[PDB]
Enzyme design. Structure first.
Site: not given
Ligand SMILES: CCc1ccccc1-c1cc(=O)c(O)c(C(=O)O)[nH]1
Ligand SMILES: [Mn+2]
Ligand SMILES: [Mn+2]
Length: 175
Positions: A62, A90, A116
């Site tokens: 990220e 991420d 998620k």
């Protein structure tokens, strides 16, 4: 203003990145302020999480443009053999040898966990709330407690700064 707070409470690198992220996909941080605030808060977790590392443990994903993030991901699979994700995560963990999806939510951690987990597929999921609550696949929280403690304090602080400025309500509710 929510917006003021964001510039006032995050290191510019993070603000600059969050602005770029939004304004490319055509979103105004002067209008979609709570998203702006959330995007910053996520990056920061991610960066914090990354830099709490085998000296260098985590690969930050990220933050990067999409060309880079996929290079970094394609590079990582070629050399370790771990499965390529369908969705950019991420982090990667060079020790435990898996990608990490970081979630930050102003709802219960089990709810944002399931959302998620639903979206994805062998990515370690780690959710932080702003109440200093976490949840991670097979309750494997990936990090020594002192590192996890700093994040939770930061997120709590960000909650509590918002609340100084009568912002928490706006933000809590826009997830
Ligand atoms: C950053 C918060 C957010 C708001 C609206 C739509 C997606 C996202 C989001 C959440 C995440 O946890 C995340 O890792 C990303 C991402 O782009 O990687 N985006
Ligand atoms: Mn991500
Ligand atoms: Mn995330």
């Amino acid at each position: 203003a929510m917006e003021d707070f964001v510039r006032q409470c995050f290191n510019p690198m993070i603000v600059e990145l969050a602005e770029k992220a939004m304004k490319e996909y055509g979103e105004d941080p002067k209008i979609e302020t709570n998203k702006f605030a959330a995007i910053c808060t996520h990056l920061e977790v991610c960066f914090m999480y990354s830099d709490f590392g085998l000296k260098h443990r985590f690969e930050i994903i990220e933050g990067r443009d999409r060309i880079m993030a996929w290079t970094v991901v394609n590079s990582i699979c070629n050399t370790t053999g771990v499965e390529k994700p369908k969705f950019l995560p991420d982090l990667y963990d060079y020790k435990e040898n898996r990608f990490i999806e970081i979630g930050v939510t102003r709802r219960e951690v089990h709810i944002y966990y399931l959302e998620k987990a639903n979206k994805i597929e062998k990515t370690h999921i780690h959710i932080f709330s702003f109440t200093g609550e976490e949840m991670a696949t097979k309750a494997d929280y990936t990090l020594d407690e002192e590192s996890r403690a700093r994040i939770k304090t930061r997120l709590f602080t960000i909650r509590q700064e918002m609340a100084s400025r009568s912002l928490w309500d706006s933000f809590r509710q826009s997830e």
